[PDB]
Design a protein around this ligand. Structure first.
Ligand SMILES: O=c1ccn([C@@H]2O[C@H](COP(=O)(O)OP(=O)(O)OP(=O)(O)O)[C@@H](O)[C@H]2O)c(=O)[nH]1
Ligand SMILES: O=c1ccn([C@@H]2O[C@H](COP(=O)(O)OP(=O)(O)OP(=O)(O)O)[C@@H](O)[C@H]2O)c(=O)[nH]1
Ligand SMILES: O=c1ccn([C@@H]2O[C@H](COP(=O)(O)OP(=O)(O)OP(=O)(O)O)[C@@H](O)[C@H]2O)c(=O)[nH]1
Ligand SMILES: O=C(Cc1ccc(F)cc1)Nc1nc(-c2ccccn2)cs1
Ligand SMILES: O=C(Cc1ccc(F)cc1)Nc1nc(-c2ccccn2)cs1
Ligand SMILES: O=C(Cc1ccc(F)cc1)Nc1nc(-c2ccccn2)cs1
Ligand SMILES: NC(=O)CC[C@H](N)C(=O)O
Ligand SMILES: NC(=O)CC[C@H](N)C(=O)O
Ligand SMILES: NC(=O)CC[C@H](N)C(=O)O
Ligand SMILES: [Mg+2]
Ligand SMILES: [Mg+2]
Ligand SMILES: [Mg+2]
Lengths: 535, 535, 535
């Protein structure tokens, strides 16, 4: 029968950006390929109640769950490597834990006590941790919960989450709880040596708060010598079979192979006494084939904020790559700044060499004149376009500006526009999954191969239903709607007007996975391949 | 001209209950008697937004300011030793600072940053500290702000307030900022020696977070030897003129004399470069005369929760003592449990030896049948009664039960009573100061020697105006009201019915001070003296 | 007139091997080129009383001072960058401080107290620090003492030296004392970013023991962005003019140019209120010319332990390079393992491509059969040879084996040899400087251009005077001796036997400096150039 649910606490030392979330995700994939029901959670030491207030260009994209919670992008890495939907519960923050305890205090639920960091804040954290172990919506209890602790050991803001994890270790005992600590091994070029001292000091910090690590992930630019691993194991009081050399992999999809080569998963399974079974590599070997052996290559313009890669579009880039993997193409992303595309000559300079244009949306942007101006170019050049949320809105304002409505805009972007073709139906923010119905033999229905779909939403403006008939004279079809028809969900040109120009109000990159590409990106990358081949 | 405003941070080590608030108050009195405009503030490390949720029998009375804020009782010690009204600003807590920062975050006021303990929580604390330095409602800038830091150095919950105080020291520099650290010197009886090691470890803890103490208050049951003070000064890196031996004083009013004997005030004034002037002892010498040389002695029953002293009635006890000081009486307080007074024989056993009965109110009590039953006894015995808030309500329900209304109660205490003579006019909670007008030649007007008064309120039930005429047939007069007459504020029997039986809806113990006793307690202790003398 | 002597404490964070000793040396050179009398000292946190017990291949060479003390090699970096002789006082260790205090205790010099880490160990450290400030053998008080603190902040063994430095800062005050902290900024390649978190945690550790850094040396593989320096200055409470970006330089002689470009020396001089004068670059500009613009290039075999660079021969390699600089040659060092040179074919394979053979000595070696075998080859091939200490001993045993004495050896290396031509005159270990007199028109006298010299010694075996006449028949001349003639100090072949083959019992690499090459290395590199050119 099933064991008690095990808890694995991934902590971090020396610095952030060591790839700790991708390490935890890869371990989740390894434990899943042995046949265990893994689930994952992140604790964020910052006070924002959710990232919906933070700028995504500075702090990365907001991820959205099926239930509509807004979360850190590591929940996106977990969903991609697990191929599992995660609840909003999967992202705790300090901002939420304090607000919850203070609200319980104002209602008198602590019966006249003084409220304190210990026990009340740590009890709320420990409650939110052990909540993840509860039977799912189908009654399946998970085998392992992998809680990743944000921040760095010895940040002030981390000290309640580490204390709650220590208390979970005290309550359940070592048979049920494992601590994995991620650390940096730096290389010093002038003297040609790897240094273990930062890992020693970081494990000493972790021991001074009452945690003993069961294993060490040694992040390094080169493979750590065995003599150094022995020195660490002796200095850190860690089993040598738990000292895992983790050099920089070529792609993120190789990290499971690195960890399996070191046998970290076997060490965890044995030390947690989990049911041992072999890793089924079949699916991930097929992914790594498509990743490493592309037959062709295509260039896609991502019409973003700036001419450089941004974590604001991490999920979009991953979804484009997965679309490529479906075709066994490479996808190379041309990061194109919107503002250079406001003039038609600037647009031609930015886009003329690419094979498709992706218009992403989000929050924290201005300057959609250059987005429309890239659409206006792409249509004349005959390039395929995929528009996501704001992308659809720019497509529909282009079409408004293609018929008579030369001053048309969104009410969001020109509050004085005489033609607000995009308008609040601040209105309701639609969040999470909503259903939609699709026109039969639409280009969208040919992509999805179904008439009914659902997608994840995060927007509050809509297509103004007063202009549907006007802008249909552009040629554009409203090939998908809410089941009542009240809301436009998808727009397309007919294939004889342009081979593939599609918009959606949703964020389909959120439902994409590397081993299960989303239909619209498979369709769009198809269209880009066909343009390149015919061009 | 006036200097920059100085900041004095009183911190605490080894344990709570060392009398740190009374020490800070006594230093405030000493600096005031030199002629400086002192003001005081407390920081509370607990998460309750205010103490109005805590039980006062477990955690002490809720103090109330003129503006109606609810605060820790140390604000009461400050008001009593300064004889100054303090704003609600004078009690910060963690509960308030977090709720404020989280609310600013939800409104987007941090412009897309991650919100962190440093800088944002420490900036909110530092802002609330330096707020105290601002010019008052008359434009007077204070000379010194004495912020007392709650908790113990090395409590987790204190670490943001100490960090904010360190940053204030960094911003203003040593010329403007002083740190006073209070510590315990224990005595070990089996080996007959005072131990300095706890003070060494507490100053080491304070130094490990970047604070250097300017002076040490050594709390002890006996006067610390000079050799030990020299050892501490050498071990702690403190000026020997800052090592202050502070043995347990006979009364709290002696603590200024202890501190002045050690010359702590001169050391502070010199080290802060404040305008040096001599202490005017005249008023406090008169207080210490009345305190130490009572001509007579009277017993007052405080009809409370239990037969032992409670911090739930600390201000009531201080106001009774100040009433005594006005007469040069001693007051001895008989702590009488209400529940023994429910039966008339039990009431007679509890009260028969005393000379007056005080019925206090508050929150966190049940059992007012025994309160009425003590009033019913006191009236038959001819003892004077002072009723505060709930005390008035019990007086008026006694009178309802004296005429025909034998099942009368408050709606608070029997929700099914057929005669709710006390009722919500949960209704409005009245908080802070409100004005009232008094009947000419009422016993209240003879006490106050004015027809217009104000008092501090904290209640939400009222006398039901539907029963005024009925209960006036008890003999009771509604000798004071709101200026519109809508609310009963004071009730009394005529002097020929009982010599002094008075109730008020307010908490007059909050406006009392040791050098300025409140009129109603001077009147009540007068009546008790006259009963004793005539009895 | 002269100020009080300033104290500069260079500390280290995150890891060792950051080049902290070379940074302190380069700052010493900069302050010297302004005209200040700098002096330097190192504190070693290890318990060895001196490095003469440690293996040099594992822990680097033992340096030797004029007075014969044995010290860490950082004293060699100080001597090379200052061009100043340093006393044995310049290397404190924990091993010495404890042994000194325990010996004073056994003699009763603490008059019956308990002896403690504080005050007695920290008083001994503080005494040894302030000793460096005393007037020199000519009466000159130094302007600055630059004490470098070994180890890493937060090593247990460092905590007494940091406490002593804090007490020096307390005693002399900020006007006289400066703290420079060296830290690592790592680069993470997968995400392309520099991380400041290790520096934040290392400065927090330094602040938790009561030290505030005046400046930060940021060691990095690339130049740190100004935005990061501003973030560090804000997070660390350091003046932005003290945040010094210190990327990896091409050669160690460039480090003064890096530090002067950042204006660190001006910041120190100003913050210490030292007499400001401009840097005279003339000599160091001439050095950097010769370093960066070599006209030719020569290969020298260093016949050592292994085929890789070793810190066991750091001073030898520096002396060879300085010899090159005198000629404006490059010197490239062929690291040749002795054991491959035991066979004549192996010797020919190891050495045939080089232009000169250097035979170094020391302790911690065996296998001098291969050293003699490289000499035997070099003589037949006509390559010049310089033999240092053990090198001379191998030359003289080669010559013993060239005449009749085929089993001759040292008594150190074959205790049963029937011909101990090298013998203990364990005998006296000669340490430090001794004088020697040289044969007129010896090859040595032509190198030194004097008949009288002194050199630094560290050996206990000698040439057996019983074999002088026998081995002179090899052709070898005893071209220098002790002034009494009792000890052989130099040996050479006549120029017609070999153009340059010289041995010495001393370690002339210790007296070499980059701006003042030692005569024997200038002569030997000359001979190698002449062989290459004629060959
Ligand atoms: O300058 C000095 C002087 C002395 N020591 C002494 O050397 C000991 C070892 O100090 P290390 O810096 O070499 O640490 P480590 O070898 O154990 O790990 P790595 O970072 O190199 O990988 C330390 O305990 C210290 O006492 C130094 O490290 N540096
Ligand atoms: O049992 C022992 C053994 C040895 N020692 C050693 O004695 C030294 C002094 O330790 P103390 O306990 O006496 O501290 P103190 O005199 O400075 O201050 P007081 O609390 O007594 O007032 C300490 O540094 C410790 O090394 C003990 O204290 N106790
Ligand atoms: O995974 C997480 C989650 C949350 N946070 C929160 O982000 C804040 C900043 O944490 P950083 O890691 O980014 O430190 P830093 O920017 O100040 O310096 P660098 O090393 O990057 O150069 C921290 O205070 C933490 O609360 C993380 O760092 N990582
Ligand atoms: O390549 C990227 C940038 C990126 C980030 C997130 C993405 F979804 C797609 C790309 N990051 C990488 N991290 C590693 C790694 C991590 C841990 C252990 C070993 N190697 C290799 S590459
Ligand atoms: O007597 C009481 C109990 C009490 C509390 C609060 C009150 F308002 C009335 C009484 N407390 C005392 N603290 C000291 C003391 C304090 C500091 C330094 C020296 N002595 C003497 S007595
Ligand atoms: O090149 C070597 C190896 C070596 C060691 C000692 C020697 F004597 C000769 C060579 N070390 C170097 N350290 C730096 C450096 C140091 C500090 C700051 C900036 N750059 C450049 S190169
Ligand atoms: N989620 C998004 O892309 C938002 C797009 C646009 N700002 C809107 O609110 O409609
Ligand atoms: N402040 C009090 O004494 C409250 C008394 C009573 N519980 C009321 O609310 O009316
Ligand atoms: N200093 C050295 O080179 C020592 C060489 C040899 N071991 C000797 O003692 O004579
Ligand atoms: Mg090492
Ligand atoms: Mg003692
Ligand atoms: Mg960062």
């Amino acid at each position: 029968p099933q064991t008690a649910t095990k808890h694995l606490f991934v902590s971090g030392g020396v610095a952030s950006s060591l790839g700790k979330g991708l390490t935890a995700s890869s371990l989740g994939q390894l434990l899943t390929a042995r046949g265990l029901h893994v689930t994952m959670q992140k604790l964020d030491p910052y006070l924002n109640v959710d990232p919906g207030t933070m700028n995504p260009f500075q702090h990365g994209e907001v991820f959205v769950t099926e239930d509509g919670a807004e979360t850190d992008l590591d929940v996106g890495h977990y969903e991609r490597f697990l191929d599992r939907n995660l609840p909003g519960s999967a992202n705790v923050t300090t901002g939420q834990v304090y607000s919850t305890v203070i609200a319980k205090e104002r209602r008198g639920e602590y019966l006249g006590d003084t409220v304190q960091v210990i026990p009340h804040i740590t009890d709320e954290i420990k409650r939110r941790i052990l909540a993840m172990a509860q039977p799912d919506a189908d009654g399946n209890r998970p085998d392992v919960v992998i809680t990743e602790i944000g921040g760095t050991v010895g940040d002030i803001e981390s000290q309640p989450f580490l204390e709650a994890a220590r208390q979970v270790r005290h309550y359940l005992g070592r048979e049920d709880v494992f601590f994995l600590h991620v650390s940096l091994v730096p290389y010093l070029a002038p003297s040609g040596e790897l240094k273990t001292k930062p890992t020693q000091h970081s494990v000493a910090a972790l021991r001074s708060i009452g945690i003993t690590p069961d294993a060490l992930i040694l992040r390094c630019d080169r493979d750590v010598p065995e003599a150094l691993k022995n020195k660490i194991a002796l200095m850190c009081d860690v089993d040598i079979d738990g000292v895992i050399s983790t050099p920089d992999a070529p792609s993120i999809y190789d990290i499971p192979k690195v960890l399996h080569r070191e046998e970290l998963d076997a060490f965890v399974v044995r030390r947690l006494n989990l049911p041992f079974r072999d890793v089924d590599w079949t699916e991930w070997d097929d992914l790594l084939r498509r990743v490493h052996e592309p037959h062709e290559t295509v260039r896609i313009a991502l019409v973003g904020k700036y001419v450089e890669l941004s974590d604001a579009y991490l999920s979009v880039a991953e979804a484009l790559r997965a679309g490529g993997f479906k075709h066994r193409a490479k996808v190379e992303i041309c990061w194109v700044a919107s503002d250079g595309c406001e003039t038609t000559s600037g647009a031609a300079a930015a886009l003329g060499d690419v094979h498709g244009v992706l218009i992403p949306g989000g929050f924290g942007i201005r300057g959609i004149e250059g987005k429309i101006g890239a659409i206006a170019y792409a249509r004349a050049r005959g390039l395929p376009v995929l528009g996501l949320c704001l992308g659809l809105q720019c497509i529909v304002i282009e079409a408004a500006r293609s018929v008579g409505l030369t001053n048309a805009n969104s009410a969001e972007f020109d509050p004085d526009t005489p033609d607000p073709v995009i308008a609040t139906m601040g209105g309701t923010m639609r969040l999470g999954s909503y259903p939609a119905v699709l026109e039969p033999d639409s280009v969208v229905a040919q992509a999805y191969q179904t008439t009914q779909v659902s997608e994840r939403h995060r927007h509050r403006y809509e297509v103004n239903n007063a202009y549907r008939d006007k802008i249909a004279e552009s040629g554009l079809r409203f090939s998908g709607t809410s089941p009542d028809g009240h809301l436009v969900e998808f727009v397309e040109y007919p294939p004889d007007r342009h081979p593939f120009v599609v918009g959606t109000q949703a964020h389909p990159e959120l439902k994409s996975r590397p081993t299960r590409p989303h239909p619209l990106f498979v369709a769009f990358v198809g269209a880009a391949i066909d343009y390149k081949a015919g061009e």
